[PDB]
Design a protein around this ligand. Structure first.
Ligand SMILES: Nc1ncnc2c1ncn2[C@@H]1O[C@H](COP(=O)(O)OP(=O)(O)OP(=O)(O)O)[C@@H](O)[C@H]1O
Ligand SMILES: [Mg+2]
Lengths: 387, 99, 151, 292, 49
């Protein structure tokens, strides 16, 4: 008696609601045996990931507790427009405009909601760095010159997760049996110039390759590292190296992953040393400068949401499925949707387009009117040219 | 040790992130010092990069290790199963405090 | 995975019967499926599946847990001592959407087209040459202890 | 009207094709010199291209002067173009296909319905030749007539990355193209190509015949390859940059393999599905003309 | 205090966790904090426990 209404009416309401803008995920497959929701997170290399689905346990005003008892009223004490037909209720066909205008409002809010965060994290993306020592293979090398090295710990904390995000084969261990051509094949496979060391002394042609090509060897530890190389030149020595920082931009160069323009490079060079709290302060000030427009329904969703965003690092934040076992899977072209391959710093295509023009504006010689350095000297001011 | 790798690996979280420093100024000042060659171990060094903090990144690998530890923990009670995942969330929040 | 497994088994039995040269009523020349979009593991199944590896004729695989064995086989082929088979398998794994077939199949496809000109068959295909392997494994699934006579 | 020379319209200095590079107006060939290739394990083997359909789509009654050139060049290399099949004004090229039509394809790349004063235009016979094939771009979208968007790219690879030997063999390893590069190089290249007067190249490719045609194919091979390069960047799965001793080398992987990818990226111009069917149809036609 | 993410302190599953943390978290007191800092460099004449 109820089944006619559940099948012939409710079904077109589920079908129509399936098309709504914000119902953005698959709900089921029909297989109880195997259906597990896809589990994306907003992972970053310099922080823990935020699962999008979590047992956060907040009831969202009782949204997440499920009373099965509700089937009883349905079967027994409820009426339907179809079941009633002996009065004939006309069916209702609600206007699109009410939900659409709401869905759009939400999309308008949450689109721009991230913007100041997005901009700053877009600038700072190249700024993450690893400490690296540069030992000198030969006499009269400038301290910048020579084989470059970093602890395995630094490769883990920074370089490796970014290799996962960039979706490339893992860099080869070099055993000293290794030909320079193999190291070349590795660097061609993983576009960052890096090779993990494994064991054994490394032959000299390979060393000249690691020097000429500025490959960053990843030594497990700095214990008598000169023993590791066939120092036939006998210039290399454990006390002879130069430690320095290496920015992620100085290694990686993927376009929508890591801003790497000489303009942003320069802008970053002008920056003071930064804590995460200083960055958060930047974001809050940029937010306070531009009070974003929103429709009244958008202010309503905003205050409903409706507070902090600051807990999550977005340094090179990406969207990636995690395995239920908890490992973060590399992007898969055949599974994950294409729009997730690179968060484009969470900016719109048009903003990126304008952003290149602006980088042309900032880097312009004519507006470089902060001047550094000065010269105290005691001359007469006879014919004053500022130049 | 051959069979107990996870123990040693957990133990490596306890290794200090500072450096050993000769008491240069105290030597120059001729301050009393019972050690033949004076020095103290400073718990942490200055940040050298413009953005990354070597200390906070260390803590990140620590909480990651621990999250793997809690994750690998067998539990039988349902509440224990719950506090497992909650422990994981609270770790992931401590990470940001530390940062 | 389980579907791809059963189909790989079917095409291997079929190709085995074809290679013996017997006339056979193959309902379709290449029995195995062509993933268009799948996880990694399916792409491995497709790869070793298209290899028609000697191991199946030798019964080196255990068919009771087929896909597992198939995954396992793929791994050896992923790091095979033979450069030819390894480069071949890698190639098949990177182009999973392409159907791979030996020439002796391809002539059957051409015959099938010459018979019915508007027959539809999968557009994206590559004709690899089968790589010979000399390792004649003894094998026998099924009960019975072996009573060796050592030399 | 512009009379067509003994060579193509491309012989005129008015129609020179030149991408900007290193502070000068480089000919496409001396940019193609900068390209280098990392071969991989995969093989591209070119199948025979299917013959383009006999059907020429109707040029429906459009009162106005369609800007055909701009449309083709933006469906091909545009930084923002999409739904190129929605309007379907490419069919308008068919109006030029008739003998003795009053329509003229202007050097501006407009299709005037009538000959008009002070607007120079191509010789109507040659344009009828060019329209006789490229009007079929109008049915790039119709289900009966879409081009393969997967197989044709192997041909692209051969005509771009191919060595003379790999080309004669008809089978080359899949290659990873690369070149020492400046900031925003692929966008600058593609915008420098969107400006090209490609109708000159197309009209000469369709009209010229005999030895005079063959000299075109050699002289303008590099131009074809440059367009091919912008397309191949449009379909490349990824476009990494490599740091190397304070010099950056842009690397697109891979030449000759359509990834079908449609999500945008800063590095290169992007195809919507419609632009995939468009470029694939364009390639079917253009290669079908190119090999004869 | 900043011990718990919002609103994990409110989640029912977290009780056994939250209480555990609350068993450990001493209230801040500058004398004790400064003392913890100073003990790092002051000499130890009676083995600490
Ligand atoms: N049999 C295979 N066929 C094709 N590719 C493989 C194969 N095995 C591994 N790979 C590739 O090499 C990487 C190796 O991953 P890893 O071996 O750590 O775990 P896995 O992918 O489960 O493989 P395995 O099952 O061998 O452990 C994978 O990312 C995969 O892309
Ligand atoms: Mg069947």
């Amino acid at each position: 008696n109820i089944a006619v209404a559940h099948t012939d009416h409710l079904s077109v309401v589920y079908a129509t609601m399936s098309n709504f803008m914000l119902n953005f995920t698959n709900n089921f497959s029909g297989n109880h045996a195997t259906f597990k929701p896809d589990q994306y997170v907003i992972t970053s290399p310099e922080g823990s990931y935020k699962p999008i689905i979590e047992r956060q346990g907040e009831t969202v005003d009782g949204l997440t507790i499920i009373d099965t008892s509700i089937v009883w009223p349905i079967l027994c004490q409820c009426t339907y427009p179809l079941v009633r037909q002996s009065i004939m209720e006309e069916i209702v066909y609600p206007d699109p405009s009410t939900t659409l205008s709401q869905s759009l409002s939400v999309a308008q809010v949450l689109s721009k909601l991230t913007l100041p965060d997005a901009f700053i994290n877009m600038i700072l993306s190249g700024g993450d760095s690893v400490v690296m020592r540069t030992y000198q293979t030969e006499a009269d090398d400038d301290l910048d010159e020579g084989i470059r090295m970093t602890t395995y710990d630094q490769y883990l904390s920074h370089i490796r997760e970014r290799l996962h995000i960039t979706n490339v084969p893992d860099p080869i261990y070099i055993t000293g049996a290794s030909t320079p051509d193999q190291i070349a094949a590795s660097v061609q496979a993983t576009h960052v110039a890096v090779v993990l060391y494994q064991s054994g002394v490394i032959n000299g042609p390979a060393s000249t390759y690691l020097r000429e090509n500025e490959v960053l060897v990843v030594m497990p530890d700095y214990y008598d590292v000169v023993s590791r190389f066939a120092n036939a030149n006998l210039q290399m020595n454990n006390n002879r190296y130069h430690e320095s920082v290496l920015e992620i931009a100085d290694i990686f160069d993927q376009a929508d992953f890591i801003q790497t323009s000489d303009a942003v490079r320069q802008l970053r060079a002008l920056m003071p040393t930064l804590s995460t709290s200083q960055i958060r302060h930047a974001i809050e000030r940029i937010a306070q400068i531009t009070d974003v427009d929103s429709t009244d329904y958008g202010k309503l969703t905003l205050r409903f949401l409706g507070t902090l965003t600051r807990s999550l690092k977005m340094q090179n934040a990406q969207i990636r499925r995690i395995r239920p076992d908890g490992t973060v899977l590399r992007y898969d072209d055949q599974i994950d949707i294409e729009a997730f391959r690179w968060s484009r710093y969470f900016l719109d295509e048009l903003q990126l387009r304008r952003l290149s023009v602006g980088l042309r504006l900032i880097t312009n010689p004519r507006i470089a009117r902060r001047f550094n350095g000065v010269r105290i000297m005691y001359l007469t001011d006879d014919d004053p040219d500022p130049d | 040790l051959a069979g107990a790798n996870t123990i040693i690996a957990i133990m490596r979280l306890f290794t200090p992130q500072g450096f050993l420093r000769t008491d240069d100024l105290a030597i120059a000042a001729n301050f009393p010092r019972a050690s033949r060659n004076p020095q103290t171990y400073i718990p942490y060094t200055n940040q050298r990069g413009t953005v990354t903090n070597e200390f906070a990144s260390r803590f990140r690998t620590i909480v990651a290790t621990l999250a793997n530890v809690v994750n690998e923990r067998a539990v039988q009670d349902d509440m224990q199963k719950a506090t497992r995942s909650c422990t994981k969330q609270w770790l992931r929040h401590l990470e940001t405090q530390f940062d | 995975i389980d579907h791809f497994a059963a189909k790989i088994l079917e095409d291997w039995r079929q190709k085995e019967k074809l290679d013996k040269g017997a006339l056979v009523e193959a309902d379709r020349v290449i029995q195995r499926l062509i993933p268009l979009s799948s996880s990694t593991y399916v792409q491995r199944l497709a790869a070793i599946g298209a290899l028609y590896p000697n191991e199946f004729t030798e019964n080196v695989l255990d068919l009771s847990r087929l896909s597992t064995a198939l995954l396992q086989l793929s791994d050896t082929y992923y790091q095979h001592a033979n450069d030819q088979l390894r480069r071949l398998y890698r190639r098949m794994y990177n182009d999973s959407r392409t159907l791979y077939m030996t020439q002796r199949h391809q002539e059957l496809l051409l015959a099938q087209i010459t018979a019915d000109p508007n027959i539809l068959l999968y557009p994206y295909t590559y004709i690899f040459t089968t790589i010979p392997t000399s390792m004649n494994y003894i094998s026998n699934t099924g009960q019975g202890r072996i009573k060796h006579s050592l030399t | 009207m512009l009379q067509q020379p003994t060579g193509g319209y491309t012989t005129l200095e008015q129609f020179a094709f030149t991408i900007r590079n290193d502070g000068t107006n480089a000919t496409p060939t001396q940019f193609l010199q900068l390209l280098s290739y990392e071969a991989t394990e995969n093989e591209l083997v070119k199948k025979t291209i299917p013959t383009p359909e006999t059907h020429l789509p109707s040029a429906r009654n459009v009162p106005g002067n369609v800007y055909i050139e701009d449309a083709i060049t933006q469906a091909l290399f545009g930084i923002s173009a999409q739904n190129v099949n929605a309007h379907g004004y490419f069919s308008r090229l068919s109006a030029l296909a008739l003998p003795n039509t009053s329509a003229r394809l202007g050097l501006d790349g407009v299709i005037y319905n009538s000959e008009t004063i002070n607007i120079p235009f191509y010789d109507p016979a040659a344009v009828a030749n060019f329209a006789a094939t490229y009007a079929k771009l109008g049915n790039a979208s119709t289900p009966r007539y879409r081009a393969d968007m997967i197989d044709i790219y192997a041909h692209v690879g051969l005509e771009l990355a191919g060595t003379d030997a790999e080309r004669a063999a008809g089978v080359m390893p899949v290659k990873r193209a690369k070149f020492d590069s400046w900031e925003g190089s692929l966008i600058s290249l593609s915008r420098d190509v969107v400006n090209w007067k490609i109708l000159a190249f197309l009209i000469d490719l369709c009209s010229l015949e005999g030895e005079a045609l063959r000299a075109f194919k050699t002289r303008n091979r590099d131009v074809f390859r440059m367009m091919l390069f912008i397309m191949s960047t449009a379909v490349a799965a990824n476009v990494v940059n490599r740091k190397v001793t304070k010099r950056v080398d842009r690397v697109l992987e891979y030449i000759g393999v359509n990834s079908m990818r449609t999500a945008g990226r800063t590095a290169t111009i992007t195809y919507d599905l419609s632009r995939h069917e468009f470029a694939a149809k364009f390639l079917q036609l253009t290669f079908t003309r190119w090999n004869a | 205090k900043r011990y718990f993410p919002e609103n994990l302190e409110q989640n029912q599953s977290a009780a056994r966790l939250v209480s555990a943390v609350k068993a450990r978290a001493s209230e801040a007191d500058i004398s004790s904090i400064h003392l913890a800092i100073a003990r790092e460099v002051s000499p130890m004449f009676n083995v600490h426990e």
